[PDB]
């Protein structure tokens, strides 16, 4: 019934607006769900955890916050924390105020009579920093200083922290982090898309209120298609890639009927929706150029892991709350052995490069063909080789991709037509992006002439479009397609190994970041009167 489309979007927007409203949308029992263990339950963790400063006090977000809390109880250490915060500010300071903020850092921290002098950074290294300040200072000026600061902190401060209540509290958060991830961890909202081995739906961690996308890979469907290794590979690439421009993995878990990937939710929707369901087809060259640059950066990040994406099409490019994009579905991504070519006729009609359609051996080149397709379609509002909803045989689409020149309208500036034709070169050996410089060749193309890629990769350029946080940029729920049921298929003990390899649970850094972002960390990380031990940290008894 038509009302179902309204219910689905009203319910999703209610969840996205911080849940019911209070507790930020956390479950009413969220403090019971995330109740700390008593410290005596953490003994095995205490025994097995590797006491590595860099991991415990910096790269793990909760461990970093707890080490900083410990340091802030010591007057001689809080100065070093202050200095690291000022270095972080300096790293994100525009280049013409760089000199003066560097001067202020110098006089605040690094002179023997500075008000918050940090003595453990070498006077000689300070003088070197002074000298290179006075001659074109750059963003990475204070790295060496920061290094020396961490080198002081990893010794005696680290070892005192390990014996403190703040490390016990870290072990409690680590216990929570490793608890089982199940169906009951989450609540499922409307379906957002269909494909692969299942479907994608909005979902929510019940305890924290944080929204995510849940990609559900149906076990019976995987088994009928013998997709076990493909499912595992998609999970493993998602976990290994850590790029600003690729959707990231926060959880992987199992249900009775499915294996689930829990992924960054992208509330701006997919680029196919923005091309075709936001007024006239396509959008302006400014937008297409920005999205193209970010997609190119995401491709470069994958190719650095020698991973070819192979599935570029507007549906697979998503927009976040800020209007930045990420490449989403990695189900067709493959790691190419160093120096070699792979074979595999995969992808979507109208988006497969000629060397893929012909089942030739290929490397990274299909992704540059796909970038050409994406730019063309963003600007024109149409596939290069298929009319909008043209009733056309896939045989004919293949023929046009292999045989026909794509046609350019007045909507294309000369640079946009140039980059499209160079990326849509049918022979891969002559294709833009497929030369020595790899993505670098694309970055200097005159289409991107006013694109500073360094500032883009550092997130310093504003997207041209910011989505309405109260709008659903997706087809209505009744219009999402659906697989037919899988039939005569039988899950065995023989799949259990595979399931166990897939269902590794929470991903450590995204989980700790979720706890911080939702303020579950701030609200739960409490102590007793005057900072005394609370009962859960008090060894004497519960």
């Amino acid at each position: 019934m038509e009302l179902e489309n309204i219910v689905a979007n009203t319910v999703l927007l209610k969840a996205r607006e911080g849940g019911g409203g209070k507790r930020k949308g956390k479950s009413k029992k969220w403090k019971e769900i995330l109740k700390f263990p008593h410290i005596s339950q953490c003994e095995d963790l205490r025994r097995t955890i590797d006491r590595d400063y860099c991991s415990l006090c910096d790269k793990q977000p909760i461990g970093r916050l707890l080490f900083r809390q410990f340091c802030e109880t010591r007057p001689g250490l809080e100065c070093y924390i202050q200095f690291l915060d000022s270095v972080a500010e300096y790293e994100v300071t525009p280049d013409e105020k760089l000199g003066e903020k560097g001067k202020k850092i110098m006089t605040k921290y690094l002179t023997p009579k500075s008000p918050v002098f940090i003595a453990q950074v070498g006077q000689d290294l300070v003088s070197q920093t002074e000298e290179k300040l006075l001659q074109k200072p750059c963003k990475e000026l204070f790295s060496a200083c920061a290094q020396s600061v961490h080198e002081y902190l990893r010794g005696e401060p680290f070892h005192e922290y390990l014996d403190s209540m703040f490390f016990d509290r870290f072990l409690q958060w680590k216990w929570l982090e490793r608890q089982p991830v199940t169906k009951n961890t989450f609540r499922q909202y409307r379906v957002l898309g269909k494909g692969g081995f299942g479907e994608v739906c909005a979902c929510q961690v019940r305890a924290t209120g944080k929204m995510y996308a849940c990609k559900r890979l149906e076990k019976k469907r995987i088994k009928k298609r013998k997709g076990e290794s493909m499912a595992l590979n998609e999970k493993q690439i998602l976990e290994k890639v850590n790029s600003q421009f690729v959707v990231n993995l926060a959880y992987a878990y199992e249900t009775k009927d499915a294996l689930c990937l829990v992924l960054t939710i992208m509330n701006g929707g997919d680029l196919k929706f923005h091309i075709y369901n936001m007024g006239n087809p396509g959008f302006e060259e400014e937008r297409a150029l920005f999205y193209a640059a970010e997609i190119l950066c995401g491709l470069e990040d994958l190719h650095h892991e020698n991973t070819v994406y192979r599935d570029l099409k507007p549906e697979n490019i998503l927009l976040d709350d800020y209007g930045h994009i990420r490449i989403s579905d990695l189900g067709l991504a493959v790691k190419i052995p160093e120096g070699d070519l792979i074979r595999g006729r995969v992808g979507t009609v109208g988006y497969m490069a000629p060397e893929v359609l012909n089942n030739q051996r290929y490397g990274l080149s299909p992704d540059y063909w796909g970038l050409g397709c994406l730019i063309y379609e963003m600007i024109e509002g149409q596939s290069p080789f298929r009319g909008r909803k043209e009733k056309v045989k896939r045989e004919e689409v293949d023929r046009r991709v292999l045989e026909t020149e794509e046609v350019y309208s007045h909507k294309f500036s000369e640079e946009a037509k140039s980059i499209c034709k160079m990326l849509l070169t049918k022979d891969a050996k002559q294709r833009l992006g497929c030369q020595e410089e790899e993505a670098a060749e694309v970055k200097r193309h005159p289409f991107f002439r006013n694109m500073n890629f360094k500032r883009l990769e550092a997130g310093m350029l504003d997207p041209p479009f910011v989505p309405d946080p109260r709008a659903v940029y997706c087809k209505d729920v009744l219009d999402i397609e659906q697989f037919s049921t899988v039939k005569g298929v039988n899950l065995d003990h023989t799949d259990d190994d595979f399931y166990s390899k897939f269902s590794t649970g929470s991903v450590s850094i995204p989980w700790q970041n979720e706890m911080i972002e939702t303020e579950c960390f701030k609200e739960l990380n409490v102590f007793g009167p005057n900072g005394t031990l609370p009962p859960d940290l008090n060894r004497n008894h519960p």
Partner: protein, 70 residues
């Protein structure tokens, strides 16, 4: 169908039944739809309601909503 799912469906229903009289009117539906940026006519609202309104009294109660959702 679990009490869990019933309770969730009840919360969704309360997103429409804003006065809690146990029915969804065309006025209430129109308020929700206009919060989604749509501008339905009174007849469009009546058509959408009528599709769900089984006993024909011109509004949707929770049993009818539940039958639609399950």
């Amino acid at each position: 169908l679990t009490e869990e799912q019933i309770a969730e469906f009840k919360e969704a229903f309360s997103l429409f039944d804003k006065d809690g009289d146990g029915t969804i009117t065309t006025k209430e539906l129109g308020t929700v739809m206009r919060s989604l940026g749509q501008n339905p006519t009174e007849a469009e609202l009546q058509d959408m309601i009528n599709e769900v309104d089984a006993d024909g009294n011109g509004t949707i109660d929770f049993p009818e909503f539940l039958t639609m959702m399950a």
